[PDB]
Amino acid sequence: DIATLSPNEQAAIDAWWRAANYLSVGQIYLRDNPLLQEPLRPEHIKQRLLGHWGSDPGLSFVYVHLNRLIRRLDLNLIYVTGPGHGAPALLANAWLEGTYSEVYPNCQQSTAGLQQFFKQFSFPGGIGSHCTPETPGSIHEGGELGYSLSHAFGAALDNPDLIVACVIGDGEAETGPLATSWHSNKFLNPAQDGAVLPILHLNGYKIANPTLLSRISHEELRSLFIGYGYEPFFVEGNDPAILHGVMASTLATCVQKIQAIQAAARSGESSDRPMWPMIVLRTPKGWTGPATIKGHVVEGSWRSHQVPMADVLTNPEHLQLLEDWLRSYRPEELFDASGAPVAELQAIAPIGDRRMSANPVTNGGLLRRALTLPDFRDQAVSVPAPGKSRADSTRPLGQFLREVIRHNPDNFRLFGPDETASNRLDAVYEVTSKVWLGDRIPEDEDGGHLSDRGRVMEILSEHTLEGWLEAYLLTGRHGFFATYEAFAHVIDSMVNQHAKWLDVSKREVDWRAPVSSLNILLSSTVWRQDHNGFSHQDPGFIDLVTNKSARVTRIYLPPDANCLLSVADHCLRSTDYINVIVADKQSHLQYLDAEAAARHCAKGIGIWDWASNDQGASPDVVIASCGDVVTLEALAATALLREHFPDLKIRFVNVVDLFRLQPDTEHPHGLSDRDFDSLFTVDKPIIFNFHGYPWLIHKLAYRRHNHNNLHVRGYKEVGNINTPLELAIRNQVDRFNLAIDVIDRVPHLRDRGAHVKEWLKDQIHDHIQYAYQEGIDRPEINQWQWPF
Amino acid sequence: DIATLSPNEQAAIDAWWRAANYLSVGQIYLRDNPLLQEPLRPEHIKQRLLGHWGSDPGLSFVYVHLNRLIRRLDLNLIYVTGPGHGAPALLANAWLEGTYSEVYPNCQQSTAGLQQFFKQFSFPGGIGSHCTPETPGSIHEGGELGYSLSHAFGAALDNPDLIVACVIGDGEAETGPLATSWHSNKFLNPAQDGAVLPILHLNGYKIANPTLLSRISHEELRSLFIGYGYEPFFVEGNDPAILHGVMASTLATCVQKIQAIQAAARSGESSDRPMWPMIVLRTPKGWTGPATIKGHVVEGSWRSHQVPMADVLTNPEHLQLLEDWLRSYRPEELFDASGAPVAELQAIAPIGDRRMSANPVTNGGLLRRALTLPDFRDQAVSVPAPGKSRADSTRPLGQFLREVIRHNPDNFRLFGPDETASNRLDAVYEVTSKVWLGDRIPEDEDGGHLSDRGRVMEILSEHTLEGWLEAYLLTGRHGFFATYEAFAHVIDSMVNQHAKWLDVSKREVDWRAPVSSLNILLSSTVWRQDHNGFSHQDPGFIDLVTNKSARVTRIYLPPDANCLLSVADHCLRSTDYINVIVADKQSHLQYLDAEAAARHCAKGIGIWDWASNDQGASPDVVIASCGDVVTLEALAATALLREHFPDLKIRFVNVVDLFRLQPDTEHPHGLSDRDFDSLFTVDKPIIFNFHGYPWLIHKLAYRRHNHNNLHVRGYKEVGNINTPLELAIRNQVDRFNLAIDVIDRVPHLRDRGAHVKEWLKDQIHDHIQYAYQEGIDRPEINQWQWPF
Ligand SMILES: Nc1ncnc2c1ncn2[C@@H]1O[C@H](COP(=O)(O)OP(=O)(O)NP(=O)(O)O)[C@@H](O)[C@H]1O
Ligand SMILES: Nc1ncnc2c1ncn2[C@@H]1O[C@H](COP(=O)(O)OP(=O)(O)NP(=O)(O)O)[C@@H](O)[C@H]1O
Ligand SMILES: Cc1ncc(C[n+]2csc(CCOP(=O)(O)OP(=O)(O)O)c2C)c(N)n1
Ligand SMILES: Cc1ncc(C[n+]2csc(CCOP(=O)(O)OP(=O)(O)O)c2C)c(N)n1
Ligand SMILES: [Mg+2]
Ligand SMILES: [Mg+2]
């Protein structure tokens, strides 16, 4: 009798829904007099209304019916809200369950608690209008639309007993990222992962337009979700007396199908991909709000999206409508004299960690277990002599990540947009494979690396991969994201959203435990351009990330393979950060052995003694590099200057942790003035070679005592199909251009360096001509090794 | 008999396809000996192979069959290529048609022309590996995937006789932007617009993984495209002798259905949304290439994506396979002794502007007609006294765009993500409406503003709107894009792609005519936060645009409504630029009348005489602003300083064209040192108030003679739910913080300004406290007017 809804049971469910709707309206409008004991006066009304109403009745309607199944079936549910502007609905249900009073004791169940609960919403010094980290039971705010469903599937990974109910706005379903994320059911393994129950809140409008999903035919809407791989169930209507029974029947059927799917998969019976149930809920927008305002239809219209009436403070006619709207929920029957919800409502609230707002999954940092990291020195390459041996930079990292996967079989995942093979991380395929629940063919057995239980997620949507990983981290797990630097601008908005979530959680919300870091590896750079990737690719993603402070993000540019291992090992232990690691995958010179790499990465920035020439003396010039390809040209420029100017003293500095250039006043992570002046002197020229836009170095280190001697050479522009040396010449980061820059900058080389400067320009001409004749660089350039 | 393919006609079509495939392989591999007259030696082979092979046979297969219908039905087709890495297929077919020889006379039809044609591809000093602007008949490079389909619909707008054939790679179909762009058929009016014939190139793989669209069941794939609103036709096979007739039949059926749809709609017989035909083409990847390499399957596998053999240069065995691969196309039967294609191939080539590569639509700048712009002074607000009257800033712009739409009924469109009403541009609804082909209800007659022939495009996907507009401009039309600044990070990648296209077209490609500018209006700013928009919204899009230099991008921050009209009028006449206009929509003070606004916008930056105090004297301080909200605080700070320091002389400077801060050496648009020193003195402090990150002003004007006196205040962090004055206080751009900044910077106020500085701090405390207890600012702040 789980499907059938008792008339006695329906009354309590309906009463809860009215109470949830009443509190939603109170949060938007009222700042005083929560229960209308006295007549509603304009001094009780908020000024500058900012909350949204249209989506709230639908969100609360789903919430109360999900609570019914939790009590009856002991389900482990969480609630992911697509329309984040419907935050007051989520807070209202959290308050009714008692979760909000536990987390925030100032908002008690009493009347005085309701004064604070209403006053705080969308108010200065209170809380926001979206599902911010302050919201209990929230892993995602719907401020930026299109990422809700990918977050739902990210939370369901490796959570076999968890069912994630994702409510999706119909306008949000028009966005790019959301349309693709429907296909995430081809990467969800029913045997080992949880289930996502997507609910399409098809209220027909978004802000001022009808939504295209609502205005297509019912047959097209059904065919669309069959094509996405779902089994759609439609709950449509406008009468709550009818929709309560329909919604209860539909949700019960969906949960039974979900549990039947998981039971079949976990017995080794139906290992093929199933058709997951989904619900299309078609209800009026502003369902229980005012019917008409100023003669225009408001309920079931786009006019109820923000507020049915925004001028209640000015004219008494709309103030009376607001009071009539509030009294239509009959609050006298819902709250007792003390202000607490009546015992009828208390009986149907779930208990403990079953409440969808006290669920520990939504505060995943509490469930987080540190990774069992193997010693990365086992994968370290052998560097007997710095700058003389060649090795693939990312191949040791793949072997290291292979051992992380082996030792963390359910805690760690690797995310990549069909570039794991391209990024030369194939070593992870020796222990695991790529998850694939779609159809398989015998041709995939050769080198496909596909299985239903792979630890590597592979889909071409950068939005979907980022959504999966962000929710995977926020639910207490660990991950690693590997992609090309060219396609990093695609996830600019998603990274900004996650950076805001981490920053608010760490500073403003005390009860949210720290989660694992978002580790992004940009495995192919803009200097060693390969077959894939557009021509004018730029390192603009580094600049965008740096806009956020060192408080929440870090940039690492390891110069070789052993430094990449140390950086990856350190970042797999950090918690509240967005770690961006830039490392090219081409065969490169190796500089530091395992022990030197660990020391160098711990310092973030240091002097390379083997490449330096100024031991026990003041250097004539400081040559600094940041980036593997950039570092090679700086070293080659150093070797050229040592051969032609034997008396020239050069100090070589390598920067790995880019944010250490900022002064320690701006952030504790940065170098102090004494430390900065010890590395880069107080008066000598600094020739800084940078992998990225040169202006960024200036932005970070303008408050230094020697900023007037900081010369930065970096990315400017990319012409089509430059050879690696030709591209460096165009941007003037080449060995020859750097040597020319040193000759210009060093005061005592401005006359004696003229003949060398002319010879360097001849070399630039010769190599450019050879690149046009052959399409490749000379063997001497490709096989260059550090002399001395 | 158009559907049936003659055996004689099939032979020529097959011969053309082999010739196209032969030239694709030659472009990837050969740099000499185009027709194998002598044995293939390793010196004929390119070094650093960069072209892609897997997608080429499918692209050429579609191309030759489209040419058949052009010759038979006289269709006006263009070819939009999703897999841009399959560029050598497009160039090969352009060469066979003779288009490439006309555009590039160095690559003639002869054997000598083939030496240059093969040598240039993916070569330094040649052409790129994607469909760059150098490619004839290309409006879109498939470097960044996901935008091909939205570009196809943008080209079809207002082009009733045009059919756009868009080939979509199955890997590309997994991306976010492409998944939602299928719904563009709900905005494409059959009576007035063209038709898009999407062809899904379902070769089963993308780079190293099977595509999810290929591995779902046929019933799911069919249901997916029915749900998208299409009528899918499946062309599946691997034998070309059989697939040639199937493809010819399917394309003929699709075109007849398209013309039947347009004929029914243009007679007023049925104005309902039709089911547009689409084609699913399932062919092996690397279709005619080597079957197996090193014992692994290559044809019909992901291993053929880049190159079946990447080692032909080293070992002779692979070199022999390459020659056997080339001879499998039988080039002795396809090219004449002189190297021209045989007369059999010449017969089936289209003639003139029907060739899909000589189609003038793809070089839309040739078809561009300048807009009939009305005089914007008719919409100008009345400003009898600067800084005293108030008006909505964007409403005059809406009335101006209303008249632009009226005078350009088929040449101009407005694009917005359901924010036209929010951005207060409702005036455009007085002449036109929003295009909507979905189901309509009588409730839409009140304020829906929906019709099948609206000039305003309204979908919630920012990716789709940007794709529509970019192709609309590249085909020679005009448009205006209005959105929120908060959601501008969504289109970062798309704007980067369009910036590359404009920059290469203007500089490197001589035959491409200039197209209209991409005019982006960010109608809601981060300083006036409203109901919509997430908590932590930042002006980072301005920074990303400025990475592209002044050659291709311009940033305008008009201070009031009349300046917005002048900026919008000027930008509707510019051609090869990305114009970003930042203008808040809230009710603001008005400063310049119609004539003064036109003069100020022409200069880009100037001294406001009415707000200045230093006439005939050296100013003590220069107060500069850039942005409407920022300008208000700068003026209020100026008024405060005038009241408390009657002897203080203040020069007020307003910046509208942001790039004029750059020196004229960097770009001719920038101010010279003489002009910059006349506005901002050579030795006085400059208090610069900026709408955006302060570091950007430093980046633009670091090399100025008075940069040591430039003190910039801008956006730092928006926090959550701050009142407008409170948000300015947090970022220290408020009137009180600016006045404090002036007191510190001016040398003779450092002692006499101490008591005023304490009073200013007391005001900051008072307004913050009032904002916490009321949620709104004081009426004195809200109703502030310029005194004097
Ligand atoms: N003080 C500064 N503030 C902001 N950006 C700067 C500054 N100095 C240089 N830049 C930017 O960084 C790049 C390189 O400048 P810089 O690091 O000074 O090298 P440089 O060789 O000294 N060139 P210049 O300073 O013009 O003689 C340029 O493209 C500038 O846009
Ligand atoms: N070369 C530069 N000089 C000054 N500021 C810079 C430079 N490059 C970037 N900036 C940025 O500009 C912002 C604004 O600083 P600024 O305009 O100098 O104001 P200010 O009052 O002078 N503060 P300060 O310069 O540190 O004493 C800083 O926070 C930096 O992030
Ligand atoms: C990409 C994007 N564009 C625009 C917005 C602005 N916005 C916020 S809420 C909203 C309405 C869409 O709501 P819908 O998904 O229809 O939800 P419902 O009202 O049915 O809950 C819009 C356009 C946004 N958040 N994200
Ligand atoms: C968003 C994005 N991610 C990654 C890439 C890298 N890339 C370039 S070509 C390509 C293959 C796409 O496969 P598909 O569209 O099926 O092409 P086809 O099989 O026809 O070659 C990929 C992933 C890209 N261009 N865009
Ligand atoms: Mg909606
Ligand atoms: Mg493919």
Author numbering:
A (entry chain B), B (entry chain A): 9 to 796
From the paper:
Phosphoketolase (XPK) belongs to the transketolase family, a member of thiamine pyrophosphate (TPP)-dependent enzyme superfamily. It converts F6P, xylulose-5-phosphate (Xu5P) or sedoheptulose-7-phosphate (S7P), which are intermediates in RuBP regeneration, to produce acetyl phosphate (AcP) and C3, C4 or C5 sugar phosphates. XPK is an enzyme present in many microorganisms, primarily involved in substrate-level phosphorylation to produce AcP.
Given the importance of the physiological role of SeXPK, we solved the cryo-EM structures of SeXPK, both free (with coenzyme TPP/Mg2+ bound) and complexed with the non-hydrolyzable ATP analog, AMPPNP. In contrast to the published XPK structures from Lactococcus lactis and B. breve/longum, which exist as dimers in crystals, the cryo-EM structure of SeXPK is a dodecamer composed of six dimeric units, forming a circular donut-shaped array both for the AMPPNP-bound form and in the absence of AMPPNP. Comparison between the free and bound dimers in the same orientation shows that the two subunits jointly bind two AMPPNP. The key residues, H706 and Y710 from reciprocal subunits (helix α24 based on Supplementary Fig. 3), sandwich AMPPNP in the dimer interface by forming π–π stacking interactions with the adenine ring of AMPPNP. The α- and β-phosphate groups of AMPPNP are stabilized by H706, H719, R721 and R753 and the γ-phosphate group by R711 from the reciprocal subunit. Instead, the negative charges of PPNP are mainly stabilized by the positive charges of the adjacent Arg and His residues. The root-mean-square deviation between the structures with and without AMPPNP-bound is very small: (0.42 Å from 7,897 Cα atoms of the dodecamer and 0.36 Å from 1,256 Cα atoms of the dimer). Nonetheless, ATP binding to the allosteric site could cause conformational change of active site residues through a pathway of local conformational changes involving three structurally observable steps, as summarized in Fig. 6f and detailed in Fig. 6g–n and Extended Data Fig. 5b–d, with further explanation by stereo views in Extended Data Fig. 7 showing important roles of P702–W703 in these conformational steps.
